[model samples]
Target: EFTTVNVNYPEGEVVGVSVLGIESFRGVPFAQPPVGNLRLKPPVRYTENIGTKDTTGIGPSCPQMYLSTGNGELLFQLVGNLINIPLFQTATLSSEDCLTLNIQRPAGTTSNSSLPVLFWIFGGGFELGTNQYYDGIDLLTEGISLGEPFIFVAINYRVGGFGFLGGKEIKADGSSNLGLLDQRIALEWVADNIASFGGDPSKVTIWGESAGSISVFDQMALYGGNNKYKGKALFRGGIMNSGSVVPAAPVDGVKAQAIYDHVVSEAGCAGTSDTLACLRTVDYTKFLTAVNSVPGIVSYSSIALSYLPRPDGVVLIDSPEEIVKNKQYAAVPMIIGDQEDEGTLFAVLPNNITSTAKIVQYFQDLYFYNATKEQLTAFVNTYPTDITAGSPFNTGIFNELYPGFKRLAAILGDMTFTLARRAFLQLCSEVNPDVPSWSYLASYDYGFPFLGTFHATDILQVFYGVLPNYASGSIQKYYINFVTTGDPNKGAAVDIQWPQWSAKKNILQIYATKAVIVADNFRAKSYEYLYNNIGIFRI
Candidate 1:
């Protein structure tokens, strides 16, 4: 049945639908749109939530380029011609007034219900993604089926140049990581407004996948100043999937300078006295085109990102690695894990570049940022040059994707995501020993040709409208149980004490069959070379 419900508050009536006993207030504005002069400015809360707004459909996503921009001939051979801007322009029309959030709860809930809240943050490599792709109705339904209902909240923040543009000028303007600030603003808004939606702001568990998971790491160590939302007030827990805390990015904006230069030079701000000022007012389309010129993650250097959220010395004081190592993370129960072949998709396209020499050079230049021959050799020694020994980890001598595809994927996968996740678990266990910090790994073969286990398969369990399969269901139940009680075993349909992570790690290995907790160290020496023993010498 269809019904209109009102969340009576300062935000007038948060008109929404009560369908199948779930009341969802969609597209609620949390912050003033960061547009025009507001571009590159810190997010400002929209105190006035007046007026009736219909948000039955998802709201606009911040500007982003899912497909590359180049000549038609160069792209037609690839999925480009059909998958360019036209492919995603209508996905959720891009706009500046896109900082909005969605809230879903059980229809019969009152303000007194005080349901635990699950705040979701989406991830697209920190470049392009939106809350529109995520709908919590399914997660809400399942949470209720197995246990108590959870209030699902997801917010849309800016991406690309609109949100993450960084440089010296941006730093001078007191704005570098505006995207993270947008997230901070949304989280603060939830703390203030979620109570009216029958959510316990005190019990908010921050959840994210990929870069979203990465943001969970950033949200914890707030610029090393202090935890502003501490004392059981704002975020009580965090959930990171396929990502972990990272080494501190350059505060000088040195790494992001190349992308910034390209953006300014192409946006008609070249050779100008005030390039940053000119860029702030340039045509949005011109800005978009210029930003698109930056290299993609799969380009030459294998998983190189031109644009990323760095430690701006403001909100994020230091590298995630430094923060974690020094115990600067927010004290919260955390659940962090990753998929088996987290490197396949990223390497599938770049697989054409076959040669151990090229892979070695990529490590020296991009991975370690020009490390010594000995350092590079030590790193390469961990993973053999043999294609059989690469990721898709136990696939035998099958190099189906390419001669060195599996091998390269193994290197990129571990360096880019997997190893970071493992180290993150270790750090959390060390710092927050009393707090329950759990880790898991996914290796259930989805049979996607050659890519085994796959990256972000658990996301299917978190967001999708379809019923969870055996593999995804186990993951979902664990999530629901964790969010509600801060323990993955309690109140879940599957009653079992999930082990906590430690130096002697006990992981709940999720597979197609009944998930089991395993005690084993995966890629121990490889991680030691990258992190522990010698350190990654992160760039």
Candidate 2:
């Protein structure tokens, strides 16, 4: 019972399929394949004028790094193998020519429909992720059910060393943060071409989870918050899940340069006169193997990622944290939130370090390398070692996987996710109260052992149609409402009105039995300290 559909725009003609009231377009190239001489550089827009195109099958993912057998094995289970949830499934089929995007809209929608667009960017720590794992049919169905149907678009960009290779050589070649540049180009494509598929380019909402969420923040902050492409706003709003403007070292910083040097040596390009050029010419398998040699987000050094977006004077002028402090970001309406135990998923990786002092030293070796022992000590002490005080938050002394697990969990959670989000929200309210913003804390799975309401767990509830019976308003509903009207409580019927973050710093706290508004000042003192001293930890 499937039928074909087609859309003709200025660029070309695309043929898609329609099923169950949804029109689907898959594997549409938004940019020329990043290969050969184009590898390691900013994306070059695809300007081909093919008369007709078939977009029936999903696209391949960008080449990804292999997971570490030890810690990576354990960490992969938490995300990829949890209850067989498909959202976290890693992409198996990958290629260098994977810069594609998929679009889904309501069937029979004409060009004048102008439906709002939900642009999804999948997150896998900048080391791995693909648009294939997330099927937006459910989200589109929910929107249709609510009589607020919208269009969904997900794009695949390069990942791992292939996308974010960093170093002085990369900086000089103007090739740092290629993955983000890929995203930027895709957004520009959407702004130029989405209307042909019955989408309102001006009403696009950029959204993502984990690394995807971080991508949303970066997109907003791109070009120092200008967020405009050729005199038009790329997106109207943003939604970030479990991420914000955390600190990032510059592309040419000591750590980034060392990583680049290590990759060059491992890839057999050390002797080349132009190492960056050599990287572009290396065999695909050889290059991917060198990337896998670095520590992944799920490796022993967990969350201390080897390749991530770094400041390039063109894309980002400084660390994201500094950009937020200076009020240099797109002040669009947004919804930003975190899982209660953002760090527990990663805390399990370093099980051997069982004491607070050892954890402090671990941080020194991993992130805060230049930080003095006294400063690092103060930072670790901010979150007490008491089991009850740590994450798996309200579990009361439970989930103490080891001597320092809880301590490290609390510290990493605040250091990377919680404090950064809190800082971003506070600054948004203080700097631009008129731009509406909403915040939430996902804690429905607080009972999950050692993981709590873990990072990216909300995917099941929001994307997979598994809403808890007690939720005042389903996050999915709020998501649709936000996409339609830029306010989570406006376009759709909601059980409870979501308060603006500017209004007394209130946040929707999602509990097991109920979702309610509450003060966002939990662990106020520690959060303040972390926010104030974030510079100490920036790599």
Candidate 3:
């Protein structure tokens, strides 16, 4: 059965409804496009009732230059090339007519059941990723069969310059964190309309990977103080992938002045005091090209500090760490953790390390920008000598030999991801211990025998059921269980004892070939290293 309805939006009427067995609709606008008079301003609702519109096709992603390599290099080399998928394809679908969402729900589900809603936020480091990349058909089918079917929704927010641009003039116009504001509007849409599609408005669960995880954190904090959402949250594995948690400064004022000066000088918009207005008048594509022409300036200065959900003292309200520390959330359930070799991918690719001195230099340059030689020496000495003593570096060296990398990885991993996870656990436990909080340490060492364990490898297993032929089936089942029940515990059929994260014990469930529950000693050691030696030794 198929039904079509005309929905009001910015560009006119949008035709939307279900197709096939999947409940699919697209291009439903959540906010007015930030262009022309609305440039660099917080997203606002469309006032006029738009005419008839067709929402069958996906919308255009924000303008961005494709990175030929780095970070996603492995995926690009292996999957993208094999499948002939373009790394980044420019779609003919252009528009300030973005801010739309695509939704899919299992057929035959009724609104009376109030099925849990899963809001899937795509991850492209707050710059890339759209609703179209993910195919949730399998996940939805499996979920329904498991008795916890949900209405799955994906959204496209502004990216790169359009979404993250901020400065003095932009801030003066009351617009900062537009990317985050776009998400807020999408959630508001869900609250208003999801029930009609057999989704529970009160039981919504916001989940994402990488940059999307950061957004999940943002929404939790944003809505917690306002009491806007009642559903739970799942912040899977990758936490600091977006680089937003690090400190930043004001959006406009000083920060804006620096960027504006640079852009005007580069774009030849100088000699006029109204350089910003002149630049704004330029075409969006032209402006983006000019902004990106300079090395190291990907989007704009606003995003360089931290895109969306910033410490603006208004929208974000408070630092996420502070909110987590004060136990100021709505006391909702959450899951957080990180991959084992979170740093290996980036570390191994750049330089081939051999000596301890070279290792010290690499850590200092990558993580600690300013540190004394003595501090670096002391930091290196802390790790076991057996781990550090090596020459003619090989890629497949185990963590035992390269303990320096492991220890440093531990420090970096904790500060980047685990620290936030621990802090969130501490705060949630303090506020409402009854609310179940679960943590996982994903140490799946795929015996590739060449590449070694790297970051984001678990994604293939999580998204797709792809595992080694000889791999245990129980490990895969645990993830499916978590997605279905919000708990990782395996029943007697699976025979894995997953423990819940508690304050009294600090137990963590490790998801390896065989699942095991162990004390969070690794995390505790990381905390100790960060507090006592992070700033001093720069680990």
Candidate 4:
């Protein structure tokens, strides 16, 4: 029966919404609002026991400028219009009181049901994303129909100036990387209170596509290594799409300092004795204006982002790459992979490069974040300067997308996203041989005739109304199995018998042309050039 329900959390009886055969609770706070004094600080436990909280309505996303057309001309034209679906196209109201989560479960579920839990985190390059945009209606509904149901949860964390304001002052205040810390509190909330909503805290799997996937890596390295589990982990399994343990630096250093100073100067707090405090006192819109002025994820800086997770010494104890390298991650079953042509969407100005010198200059300085000259020259040769020999890697010669775009897209994509992903799968396999980890390469052409297997196109899988169902259906079933039983093949209703990732190079390759298992080391010579000389690449 379609009706409302009240979920008891430590805070209060949260008002929940029910429709058809599903029950959902929205905007239930997992932590106290980081407003006023708590602004730019680590999140604190939500101890509100006041009255019944209205969680039936939609919740505000963490403070962020509406991204679509407002982001910039490049992003608007390249991504905004093509992603045309309502999920990626709409704008929502946001406020500081956005540290809440939405929970969905099959109707009539009880605490005794103890169903598996899938806690999803949305990604927008660590700058712009929201919980409100995703309606897990089909994720829950289809899950029930498959007889592999789960209690799905999506939480909104801070973004932009409100979440990831970087600087020496922020580090000194012990507030660097507060966005990741907010996620930490939300996960703790899930473990302690999810049972009340008929979710098994013991059988939890944390899932995210892009930036959220990066946080999944962060969580694996959290709590000085106590955060992971073969079985002791706060989360039983993990799914990170297009991300892994990457790199970052200290807040007081040149990179962090430069970004911090720019924001402070932009926000009119440059000369203030306490810039962090000055920022807090400053009007929210003023601070937001300055924050938006900085380069975004797809700017010249690319994923060597100005506003992203760094070695904060608090939330992030060291470089995330090191964390993955040392195997200081939870030994959990993980589904880690990336989409082909990921760099096309991310490298906005690829068409601008006309020469190898210009490509090298832009990459080493802007995209690669100051990689070594010798390595830059060496890495530059991996991709052909000829237009057609680039990204849609398998397509025949003569660049159909654009002349320089394909060549540079390969350059940008490999270094920033894909290569690092390979490193992740390789290193994680090296570290925890016993753990079951699956690697995938998504080459699905989701209506983007020009952009082949572009970033996050596979993410649109849950919206069954669009595109071919077989592709997304295969993905959905695999994920459901992974979340439910810690093994993707356990209850797999599909034909894809995804192999575990290892040095031997076994992998599940899902292609737009067709699905097949490709070698983990697809481009051996190029991958070796980058992977072998990892130290030379600053990023």
The most accurate candidate by TM-score is: 2
Off by over 4 Å in 4: 66-75, 78-81, 85-90, 228-232, 368-370, 398-401, 465-468, 512-514
lDDT of each: 0.74, 0.84, 0.54, 0.76
Clashing residue pairs found in predicted model 1:
223-317, 246-321, 248-319
Pairs in steric clash, model 3: 12-50, 12-51, 13-51, 13-52, 13-53, 14-53, 15-53, 167-252, 168-252
TM-score of each: 0.92, 0.97, 0.76, 0.94
Query: Where does candidate 2 stray beyond 4 Å?
Result: 73-83, 86-88, 466-468
Q: In candidate 2, how many Å is residue 181 off?
A: 0.7
| Candidate 1 lDDT score at position 460 | 55
By TM-score, rank the candidates, best first.
2, 4, 1, 3
User: Candidate 2: deviation at residue 170, Å?
Assistant: 0.7
The best candidate by lDDT is: 2
Which scores higher on TM-score, 2 or 4? Answer: 2
Scored by lDDT, model 1 comes in at 0.74
Ranked by TM-score, the better of candidates 1 and 2 is: 2
**In candidate 2, residue 394 scores what lDDT?**
74
lDDT of 4 by residue, 129-160 (tens): 88887777887777887789999999888876
Name the runs in model 3 displaced over 4 angstroms. Answer: 1-20, 68-96, 110-113, 227-261, 274-276, 294-309, 352-411, 430-434, 448-453, 465-497, 503-513, 531-539
Poorest 10 consecutive residues by lDDT, candidate 2:
464-473
Error of 4 at 279 (Å): 1.6
